[PDB]
């Protein structure tokens, strides 16, 4: 594999069509799904030359811990859909690569088991109709050694996935929500309840409006993820990468600002960094690699991404991620 | 049916080619027809998160009455062209859905019969060479219980429909203008004559210039429809959605501002609302549903649109249409 | 024929490939040829409603005489290439339609014969290496009753026509330059020599820079044609329609400002007018009609264009060409 | 051959696929490769009319010597890959055409032999891990009569060429680095070492950031090449032509400013000049001509380019390259 695009084809071959569609699809006409890619492709980097590259490092410090790349594995539900070892395979590879892994509320392996793998586990929270269950999940995650709560705030309910509707897609009975034995819309009061219930940094995932980013900082969030949920929620929602610069300026260092949606290479990581992001999340490509070759597949993906990030940073004259954030960009056609 | 696009294919199958062309076509090279869609697709919404969605409502108050959605059925002539029950089928479905239905001057069922169906009938007026006939139509409409006069102002004469010319399209003899037993260009004097002759709100349909919107308010119009007539009049006329924001700002609450042209989903409705529209008109899709399955087809269309509007509003953090109008947007590529 | 596009296909059928290529082609990669169309298609008109249309007129006064449309036939060399009757057929149709016809320096019928047809003949001048021959042509044109000298200023030499080079295209021996029994670059001194030698208005064709338009007025030109020569001279030259607005503003009524390049409908004429043009030139479509059906073909073309111009003007609320020049426009995608 | 595009097809036929890919390809997804062309195609020239063209000259003075065109042959490694005579064939043709030829550090014929050909040889330098070898190359080049040192500054290491990786491309054993019997990242200290070691003008190739251009002048560079290395280094790097205008303004005559990337015609040369460039480099097309017909092929290419430059300049009203730099441009779609 010399690019992430190699993996998608491999995954399409092995996966049942209905499952590949669940993974690949977006909501409505998939306008926001496509726009995530279009938006990245319009961004060009202005590289710097002739700087010291004797010790190029791709490492960052985030939420108290060192990470090997400015990157984490995005929360993706029911990973046993893509491979028998599911979340355990991905978590093991992420651990080995020094990249944070985000355990899902809807993981098909329990959060305690995934956390036992080690590494840098974060935990993604969906707000539940029974609030006490949501706060219990948070407590479970913290007890199991998760380092951050990624509170998903753009899913008051699931978007309308036309591929899934057309396929009549449903969870195979061999895939379950292992954390349970349903959703409620989250509000700012929900965020406060979570913040008061944990010492872990709370990260609001799915922020797109500048004033929501400001309010996130005021609410005590340790980070936000600028995101339209991979084009899977509001169809017609602006791509996060189009809002990123404005949001980074507005929060003015008040919290970590992550972005996701369409990151498909080290060059894309460089673009996000240059626009001001602390780090990116990567979703579908990690699942392509999992589907294609299990744990070893994800390992290969992360090794490829690591080399592409180092390459891009050096070619752009950046010895550190901090330097990459000070790069300028130019919009193209 | 999970999208409006499902309906168009169904309608293409059942309709004679010449009739589908009458419905689908625009004037000239159909530049303005295509531009209505292109313009909507360039608009992206910036959604808000973490707001109270306990009582999401899609209802609006317009021209004195509550409507179930920020939407009305656009005036479309000769609906018996598409289905034997014609206007009666559409009006019944609209009534049941709580959506205003616009009775046409050129309806293939008399306006009194359509009005007898009940619901929220509006009446669309074409100015006639004999002025007295036009004012008589207005009186008939008011007597029959219509709630608004939609005065079409962008048809001094019909545009050049090249599909119709090439097909040699003509009304089948089983389709007639049931309100009669011809056009004259309307002027601002015509508007005043109508306004003086009725207590009903007068709505000017086909406004695109900012100063025409201003003058509409000065002329005592209760509303305007920002519209290039679905690309069927001036070929090269700007899409209404491109003028909407500027017009909403200029009239500064002085009348209702509706828009139409290319609305094909709840997400499109959200975009129009976010740009400032009070409500939208939907034309061709209603006729697709009518052609495909008569009254039940239109019912299904309106139910689908209702769910898509609620979904879009909630995902964008809007508990009311008023909230949706305060959303910001961003132009994309 | 219901559009100009109908004619092009007809002409492609009947013409030898090499001759159709001479007519259709541009210089270099034909970037400027394509850009003339792209530029027009990006322009949208903001129409006005509810104005008096009782006496819509498409007539203009230009260079002392009334014309039936804001349009003239562009100079096109060697018209016997396209039809046996060549320039005589086109001139007769133009006369009958009340549209000025531009006699070429390189006409395949003598300028005296074409002028004898009557109507509103203009004469297009190429500057010749022997200056006295050029001034003699001007005198001949004036004596024969031509009403304007269209001095072509963007051909110091002919551009590189790759279609012609690839075809090894050459004039058939049955086609000659009937005004003769060669080119020199024109300068501002050449313009002055022409102006001093005639009482006719001098029109500089091929102006694209704003300061060249200013200087044209200072030099005593009665008009200019904003033009990149139909994409046949400098490949990469900006389309005239993209410079038109700026040029109209700069000359501030000091001379007539015409435009050409890609005018293919009445709607296109409306766009040019709305951008400030006094009138347009139409080139290739007139030759399509000539090739397709001789004099009657051109007559049909001009009748179609006349109806399209009236239609567009009325639908845009313009009772006169002057009103059309006060229309606003909006750039689209 | 009537255009450079003719040559590429000829070269594709004769070259082994792996070698054509080495020549044609870029890094990553080849976004920057494509963008070089897209960026040029968006630029339109505003030509001037009616100026004196009695002595049109395409000559420039650069780095102390007259050149026949505002153009030099770009450094391209291992030219024996494309033709048995390799660099000698290209250098001979360039000499005959009065165009500077850039001898590569990785030439497949020694720099002394290529320099012996005569003409205007420049020498391109890659910084070596052993610094003394790099300074020795500089001394060798100066002793052999090279007139400028083109220090490549955008290759701390080679970019990721996915075509090459997929092909498993490697140098055939009959092709060697003839200057040797490896790379180190260059810094501003390296530039200073070179500048102190030679009296020749030092030209920094691969500058894209405005402040790097400023610093180049401060560092004593005699020129820069605004360049993203033909899309072969950082994938996503902005095209040089998009940065050119801003850079020309910032250096304010302090050094020569060259540009490369996608120059494929005399018209493209005119565009670069109009944006402010002193001269352009041309890379891949020279190799197409070499592959297609050896020395005579390159001669034909340079003759074609010379005619296209003269043509473009004259049609734009420019009697000199200096005049061409004062042309205005307009961005299109
Ligand atoms: C199949 C699938 C399942 C997902 N499940 C969740 C989830 O449970 N919670 C969440 O916050 N985001 C979820 N996401 C969104 C991702 O976290 C992330 O925002 C998005 O996938 C990133 O875009 P990318 O896939 O283009 O890299 C899911 C995405 C996909 C494709
Ligand atoms: C077949 C057809 C007939 C129409 N008849 C009328 C009419 O009689 N009066 C009128 O004001 N608008 C008429 N319209 C325009 C619609 O009211 C409306 O402006 C347009 O269709 C909305 O665009 P949409 O079809 O993309 O939703 C007609 C449109 C179509 C397609
Ligand atoms: C075949 C052909 C011959 C032309 N000959 C002349 C000419 O002799 N003198 C001149 O000023 N323009 C000449 N033109 C340019 C036209 O006058 C005019 O600028 C251009 O054709 C208008 O663009 P259009 O063809 O898209 O309408 C010629 C154009 C064509 C296509
Ligand atoms: C096959 C190939 C080899 C190249 N080798 C070098 C090189 O050794 N040193 C260098 O500075 N640039 C090198 N370049 C880049 C060119 O000097 C130049 O920047 C680029 O090719 C210009 O773009 P163009 O090919 O579109 O004209 C090479 C380019 C190609 C295609
Ligand atoms: O986008 C997703 O797939 C999600 O995991 O965030 C979800 F919660 F919306 C979802 C959607 C469908 C099935 C399961 C979970
Ligand atoms: O756009 C229409 O179809 C119209 O109903 O508004 C009309 F009046 F222009 C028309 C056009 C053709 C046939 C009937 C009515
Ligand atoms: O663009 C033309 O075809 C022209 O008529 O203006 C011309 F003079 F450049 C020309 C070009 C080729 C053959 C004859 C005349
Ligand atoms: O871009 C090139 O091909 C280069 O010559 O500049 C190089 F040095 F990067 C290179 C790349 C691959 C093989 C040899 C040289």
Written description of the protein model:
Four copies of one chain form a homotetramer. Chain A has 333 residues and is an alpha/beta fold. In chain A, the strands form three sheets. In chain A, strands 4-11-10-9-8-7-6-5 form an eight-stranded parallel β-sheet. A two-stranded antiparallel ribbon of chain A has the order 1-12. In chain A, α4 (86-97) runs parallel beside α12 (284-315). Chain A has 13 helices and twelve strands. Chain A has one domain (4-331): TIM Barrel (Alpha-Beta Barrel). Chain A has helices spanning 4-14, 17-24, 31-41, 86-97, 111-116, 131-143, 162-167, 188-197, 210-218, 240-251, 266-274, 284-315, 321-325, and strands at 43-46, 60-62, 65-67, 71-73, 101-103, 121-125, 149-152, 202-207, 223-226, 256-259, 279-282, 328-331. In chain A, α5 links the parallel β5 and β6. Chains in contact: A-B, A-D, B-C, C-D. The A-B interface holds A 28-29, 31-32, 35, 38-39, 42, 153-154, 156-157, 159-160, 162, 165-166, 185-188, 190-191, 204, 206-209, 212, 233-239, 242-243 and B 2-3, 41, 43-54, 265, 267-268, 270-271, 308, 311-312, 314-316, 328, 330, 332-333. One 3,3-difluoro-2,2-dihydroxy-3-phenylpropanoic acid (9NO) is lined by residues 77, 106, 155, 158, 229, 232 of chain D. Chains A, B, C, D: One of its GO terms (biological process) is vancomycin biosynthetic process. Chains A, B, C, D: Pathway: Antibiotic biosynthesis; vancomycin biosynthesis. Chains A, B, C, D: It catalyses: (S)-4-hydroxymandelate + O2 = 4-hydroxyphenylglyoxylate + H2O2. Chains A, B, C, D: InterPro entries: Aldolase_TIM, Alpha-hydoxy_acid_DH_FMN, FMN-dep_DH, FMN_HAD, FMN_hydac_DH_AS. Chains A, B, C, D: Residues 1-333 form the FMN hydroxy acid dehydrogenase domain.
């Amino acid at each position: 594999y010399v690019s992430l695009a190699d993996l998608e084809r491999a995954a399409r071959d092995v996966l049942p069509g209905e499952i590949f569609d669940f993974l690949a699809g977006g909501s409505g006409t998939e306008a926001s799904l496509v726009a995530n890619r279009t938006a990245l492709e319009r961004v060009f980097v202005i590289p710097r030359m002739l700087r010291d590259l004797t010790d190029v490092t791709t490492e960052i410090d985030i939420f108290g811990r060192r990470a090997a790349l400015p990157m984490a594995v995005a929360p993706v539900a029911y990973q046993r859909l893509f491979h028998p070892e599911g979340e355990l395979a991905v978590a093991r590879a992420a651990r080995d690569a020094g990249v944070p892994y985000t355990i899902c509320t809807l993981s098909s392996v329990s959060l305690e088991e995934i956390a036992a793998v080690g590494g840098r586990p974060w935990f993604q929270l969906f707000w539940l109709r029974d609030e006490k269950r949501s706060l219990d999940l948070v407590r479970r995650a913290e007890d199991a050694g998760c380092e951050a709560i990624v509170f998903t705030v753009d899913v008051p309910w699931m978007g309308r996935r036309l591929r899934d509707m057309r396929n009549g897609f449903a969870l195979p009975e061999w895939v379950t929500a292992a954390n349970f034995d349903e959703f409620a819309p989250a509000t700012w009061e929900s965020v406060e309840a979570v913040r008061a219930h944990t010492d872990l940094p709370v990260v609001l995932k799915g922020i797109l409006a500048v004033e929501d980013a400001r309010r996130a900082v005021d609410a005590g969030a340790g980070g936000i993820v600028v995101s339209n949920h991979g084009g899977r929620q509001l169809d017609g929602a602006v791509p996060g990468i189009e809002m990123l610069g404005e949001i980074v300026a507005a929060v003015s260092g008040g919290c970590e600002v992550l972005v996701d949606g369409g990151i498909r290479s080290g060059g894309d990581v460089l673009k996000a960094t240059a626009l001001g992001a602390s780090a990116v999340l990567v979703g579908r490509p990690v699942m392509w690699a999992l589907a294609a070759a299990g744990q070893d597949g994800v390992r290969q993906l992360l090794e490829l991404l690591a080399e592409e990030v180092r390459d891009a940073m050096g070619l752009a004259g950046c010895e550190s991620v901090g330097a990459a954030r000070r790069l300028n960009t130019k919009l193209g056609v």
